Write a sequence for this structure.
């Protein structure tokens, strides 16, 4: 419910490769009143409407997203979790392309 952390801050991507990107972020301002336990990473190709889980329960401020396809544009969103589930998502600023 409303025990939701705020969004992670400064979601950014770098270190692009043939098949991966490296996301980094900072902790949310509000943890929802319960300690943060991890982050959840989702992705979607820009032309599809569906978000897809990449990894949950990430205990870091970063994640290398694997198995990305050359020629596709991708979006990513990260949410912080606490014991009551994930909070509001942070979004990348622009899609990631591949080549
Ligand atoms: Ca680390």
């Amino acid at each position: 419910g409303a025990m939701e952390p705020s969004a992670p801050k400064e979601l950014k991507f770098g270190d692009i490769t043939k098949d991966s990107v490296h996301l980094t972020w900072e902790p949310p301002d509000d943890d929802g009143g319960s300690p943060l336990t991890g982050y959840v990473v989702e992705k979607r190709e820009v032309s599809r409407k569906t978000w897809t889980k990449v990894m949950d329960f990430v205990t870091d401020l970063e994640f290398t997203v694997p198995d990305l396809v050359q020629g596709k544009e991708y979006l990513f969103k990260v949410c912080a979790r606490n014991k009551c589930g994930p909070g509001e998502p942070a979004y990348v600023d622009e899609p990631v392309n591949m080549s």
